[PDB]
Design a protein around this nucleic acid. Structure first.
Ligand SMILES: [Zn+2]
Lengths: 104, 204, 159
RNA sequence: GCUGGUUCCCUCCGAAGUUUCCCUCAGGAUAGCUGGCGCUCUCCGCAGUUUUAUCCGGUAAAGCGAAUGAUUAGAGGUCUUGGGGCCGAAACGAUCUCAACCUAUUCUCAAACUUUAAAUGGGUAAGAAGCCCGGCUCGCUGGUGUGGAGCCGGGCGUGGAAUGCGAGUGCCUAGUGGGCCACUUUUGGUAAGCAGAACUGGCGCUGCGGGAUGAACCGAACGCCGGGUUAAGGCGCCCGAUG
RNA sequence: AAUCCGACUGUUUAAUUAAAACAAAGCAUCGCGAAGGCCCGCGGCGGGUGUUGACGCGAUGUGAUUUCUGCCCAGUGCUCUGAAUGUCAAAGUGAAGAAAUUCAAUGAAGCGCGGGUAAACGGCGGGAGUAACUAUGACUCUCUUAAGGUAGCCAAAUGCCU
RNA sequence: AGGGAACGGGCUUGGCGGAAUCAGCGGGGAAAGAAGACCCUGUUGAGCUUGACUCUAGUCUGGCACGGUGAAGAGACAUGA
RNA sequence: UGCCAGGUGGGGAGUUUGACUGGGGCGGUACACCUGUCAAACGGUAACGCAGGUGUCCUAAGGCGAGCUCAGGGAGGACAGAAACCUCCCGUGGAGCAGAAGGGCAAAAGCUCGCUUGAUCUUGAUUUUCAGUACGAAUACAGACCGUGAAAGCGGGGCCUCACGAUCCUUCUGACCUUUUGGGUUUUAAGCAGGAGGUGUCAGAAAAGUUACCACAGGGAUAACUGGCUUGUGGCGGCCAAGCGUUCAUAGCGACGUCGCUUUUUGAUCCUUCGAUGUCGGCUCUUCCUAUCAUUGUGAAGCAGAAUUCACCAAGCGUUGGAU
RNA sequence: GUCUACGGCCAUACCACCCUGAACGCGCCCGAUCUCGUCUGAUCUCGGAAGCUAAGCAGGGUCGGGCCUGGUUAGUACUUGGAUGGGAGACCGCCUGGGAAUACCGGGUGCUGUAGGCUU
RNA sequence: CACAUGUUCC
RNA sequence: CGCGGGGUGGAGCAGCCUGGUAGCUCGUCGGGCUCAUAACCCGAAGGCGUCGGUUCAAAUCCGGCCCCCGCAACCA
């Protein structure tokens, strides 16, 4: 699916519709020092094999695409994520498809 | 190579005609539904001898063909090759099924065998029209066609003029007074409800 | 097992009648519905938003809430152990005035007219409705002629 | 979570093999059915019922000369075209046709077709929680103390169809979650004492008279007895009764 | 008089199977020069082989004699070398920060990469063209994955049709 | 023979039946011997195998400590024309 | 040698090896959903019942506003004909609306343009499966910021019916948000609310085989015998009569059709038995049936004799020795 | 009686052809500078009023089609409940109540709300 | 460093 | 999930680390050579997976995407 790089939508802090910068959010590093990671590293330390299960029954062939709305208006800089239905193709701000054009 | 007619004599299931869903059906054995001197007017075959069923059963296409040939075979010999006009008034549309073996009934749905004709009580099976001197030639020939059909059938000579829906004792005067116009196998009923220019087309 | 869809088996339920398709008449939209009005449900296939479920089709309810362009009513639905007085939101095209109540209201007005009347007279006029009584024995006449004899028909095979 | 067993009497009430979920299918939980404990009122209120008005259907039936799909046969057509020829250099010039197409007919249908369209059914309403008045509030809507809603005060009893029944309500709670048969409707299967659905009634849980015998068939349901009379069945003997 | 199997003597399921099964001499491999090869042992400057030294020890496959043991290292194994170097943990090094911490370079063995090995496990088909009747193919080309069953043998203890 | 839970010694309708026994005999008593092992279920196990999921003995490699002494060389960094 | 770190490691250890199923296994998903039908005219309603479809796609195929009519057919017009392009007429939609199907739609919900991101933020209520619990989907609202249109209004995704996922953990986002446990500051960390990373066995374990060396608890809730219902199949017997029989349907036959019997075949079902009914054949022996091979008695033949066919009463007596 | 503007019911209103329209009207019609949009004032928008019922529209007619409403079809088909009814079955008959749809044959071819006109 | 072969009777 | 590498005429390999000609074989149309066949020698097609940029100039150096395999990894 195609979404533009710019979208004028609502902003929480200002309270008015303002233009926003559109980009795709990607998963960050686990940071190795979370409560669950520290709990899991202590539990897996020592003998006993492995304590928590490993999910190995994947069935989804896609992911829910997520945007990252950046507020372009200065001194606000409010970030937000908007959820869009599942798809396996995703690009930004290109090929507006030119309705009424050559098919070949 | 097929099962006997005892298996499919009764109307057991809902009507299952050959359609978009019911595809892959082998062609019915009966193709020609009327023969004889079919290119004939209604003024020369005013008998209308009928075959009437008496039970609520199923008539297979090969059973209709069996009674088509034997009734026609003697009827040609009796009065002549073109002294009659016969019809069958059952067109086999219901499709019967087979659960073919080589598992049991693990996912057992039928496959088409052929067509079959649903009949009600008192519905005409076979219609024969000819002249008045061949009345006994039609009745006993229809008795020969009873043996090709399962169940009980009765022989009735109708009071209709030919293959029309009008009574034979009063068919003449509407022709003379011009309320009926023959068109080959049938007749045209002329009501007094059309344009008057159609009335001016006749009566002149 | 059948599916659990919202519009299962609504091939003939949510379908417009013969030669009644096209633009919806405007008299159904601009009808007025107060609180407590007796309202029956008939789903219309042209409009789709605010469409009631097929289990309420043909049922009647009572108005408890009136919004801008929809009316909330309380219907009586029975589900396998009891009748639920449940609350549904439905658009106007599925809303018609039920005339089952209208026969009772016109009777109350006529009874109260006959209650104020004959109050100065005191006569006990029959006020309640009564079922069909016996047919009040009467004389029947024939004008000279005798009742003509009827006869069962002889059997002839029509087919 | 699987078999076997589970110890005195009497009285009263008394089921289910079903909804949903669970690596659930020999099992549990949850709803349903039941029992007990009670409570709030009576000496208006509620009905596996009917009637009066009001809507809902798309099933049986019927139709295709009405739509969609399938389909038989003859008629009248004209150039709307074409294959075989024939008089033609050729020509919608002529000419017998034969083909598809068109127009009025005609035979037969459709669980996944329908113009129509039942019977049986499903909701309502049949008054006091209803009417008719007069007036206040509104921050909602507003040519208009407009509309709507809510508050007050007041008057109407002639209990506003039939029939019958004293009603409502709150706690725990066992057992059940393998069902089967039959009138009718009906799916798969040739058929089955086969498998799978709907309503109702039975066996399960139930004895009794009868069908010689007996799950489910007909009648009829049960504290212990006497008299009388019957249902369904019967009345040559077995065997009560037409000896 | 013949066929099959096992060469044979021998042993085997005490208590249903004495054999075509096991073993066997022969044959062909693999590892090891002793701080070693194989193995035991919780442990030790431990122990068995070993009171032993490649004509030995330990692990294998086949099964007398005769004859022969063909092709294939693509796959799975085993083994060889190697800054020609992708990946690569701990520890150590450098940088930032108030520090925990983060980043970077470096980066062993082993996996990859490249050779060898089938008396290692194993596998050994089609298609198309093609010889003076037809048929067939002496010959030529291609893949899948590396060749396509060579010498021999049989309707076998191995062939469904039978 | 019938029906029954779909093959009765008991029930029904019939055939009918007479103390106590001896020697054989294997038709039946769905004879006895053993909670079927063939089949299935159990969220019951056991033996064995591997490309099953977790581990682990053993083994190889690297670091730290036991670990001292001297001499060259060499790689990177750095200084740097 | 001791301790760490990495590799190898069925040599050894523990555990697993889903469910539905006309027995099991194989095959399929009837395991999560959607349409029409079965479905018996409210609704609900089953089978490995039927035809199917889904785990997508869309910056527009969403939201307004504006203008047109589509499929198809007829008449014409240089190339141009059956279909290239233009005009006129008919055209209830027979086209199109993303998909499977159903419903619905004509100055639209379809085709073409202009502008936009209501596919934005936040409470609650209701419907759909329902236990009337969730998830998902949807329906009216309410509070705001907007888009569009002149305005009324329309729009908080797709014309409607499906296009999807709990706990814990992780990631990101937001507040001049709380704690960081003696007080203060900072980094960090734990929270609150929202979204995402998925459990397809789809209300969500982390999971390969074999046993003929096997064992245990059970099941006739369930197969491999017989028996029981039925007779698809096998075998057998009939009815009509187009013809064969040198001419002649019926001496003997008999197609195309059609009606029945049998449990000496295979099927179908699981009703009996898994606290056991010993599971193939051959040998020996007893009895019974006729759908009669021969013998007794007969009738009819395309019965000259002989030999040989069809039919009847008829089970009394026989139906062999051997090779494989 | 009739028309215009806005409608309600949405064919008794639609469809095909023919005839008649006095007055007001509705329209046909004449132009393109301005507002407006096209390839073109054909459409739309604007500025008008020389002609006209030719067309649209209104009314009437067709042994008209269609549509609406009735009779027939027919108490037929079907169907609630019942029987120790028949029949080997298939199916059918009876009691009890309810009750259809074709073909075919008749009648009709728009009412009506508000505001504003004409027939003064 | 390669070079293979020229259908039969006369 | 992060460290890599590679996609090339009708088909198989370079040219890439460094930008300057898209090349070499094999199949095809032919031309030569030998008296002729065979063999051999030659001319011609037809192509850097995709987007953008740095640059005098790109297949080449870069960044992002489609198709593969090498590894090391794994609590919804
Ligand atoms: Zn902002």
């Amino acid at each position: 699916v195609n979404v533009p790089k710019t979208r004028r939508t609502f902003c929480k802090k200002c309270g008015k519709h303002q233009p926003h910068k559109v980009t795709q959010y990607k998963k960050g590093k686990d940071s190795l020092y979370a409560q669950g990671k520290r709990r899991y590293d202590r539990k897996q330390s020592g003998y006993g094999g492995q304590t928590k299960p490993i999910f190995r029954k994947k069935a989804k062939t896609t992911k829910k695409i997520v945007l990252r709305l950046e507020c372009v208006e200065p001194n606000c800089r409010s970030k937000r994520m908007l959820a869009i239905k599942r798809c396996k193709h995703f690009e930004l701000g290109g090929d507006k498809k030119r309705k009424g054009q050559v098919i070949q | 190579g097929r099962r006997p007619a005892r298996c499919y004599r009764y109307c057991k299931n809902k009507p299952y005609p050959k359609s978009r869903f019911c595809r892959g059906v082998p062609d019915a054995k009966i193709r020609i539904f009327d023969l004889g001197r079919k290119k004939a007017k209604v003024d020369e075959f005013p008998l209308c001898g009928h075959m009437v069923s008496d039970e609520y059963e199923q008539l297979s296409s090969e059973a209709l063909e069996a009674a088509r040939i034997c009734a026609n075979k003697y009827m040609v010999k009796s009065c002549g090759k073109d002294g009659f006009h016969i019809r069958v008034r059952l067109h086999p549309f219901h499709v019967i099924r087979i659960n073919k073996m080589l598992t049991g009934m693990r996912g057992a749905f039928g496959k088409p065998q052929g067509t079959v004709a649903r009949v009600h009580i008192g519905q005409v099976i076979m219609s024969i029209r000819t002249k008045l001197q061949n009345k006994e030639h039609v009745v006993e020939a229809l008795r020969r066609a009873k043996f090709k059909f399962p169940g009980r059938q009765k022989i009735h000579i109708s009071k209709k003029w030919g293959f029309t829906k009008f009574n034979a004792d009063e068919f003449e005067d509407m022709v003379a007074e011009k309320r009926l116009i023959p068109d080959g196998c049938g007749v045209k009923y002329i009501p007094n409800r059309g344009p008057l220019d159609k009335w001016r087309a006749l009566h002149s | 097992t059948n599916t659990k869809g919202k519009r299962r088996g609504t091939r003939y339920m949510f379908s417009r009648p013969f030669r009644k398709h096209g633009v919806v008449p405007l008299a159904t939209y601009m009808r007025i519905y107060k609180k407590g009005d007796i309202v029956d449900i008939k789903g219309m296939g042209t409009v789709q938003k605010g469409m009631p479920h097929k289990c309420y089709h043909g049922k009647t309810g009572r108005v408890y809430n009136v919004t801008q362009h929809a009316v909330g009513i309380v219907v009586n639905k029975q589900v396998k152990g009891k009748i639920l007085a449940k609350r549904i939101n439905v658009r106007i095209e599925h809303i018609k005035h039920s005339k089952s109540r209208d026969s009772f209201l016109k009777r109350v007005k006529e009874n109260d007219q006959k209650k104020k009347e004959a109050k100065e007279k005191g006569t006990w006029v029959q006020l309640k409705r009564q079922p069909a009584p016996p047919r009040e024995a009467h004389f029947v006449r024939t004008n000279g002629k005798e009742p003509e004899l009827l006869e069962p028909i002889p059997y002839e095979f029509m087919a």
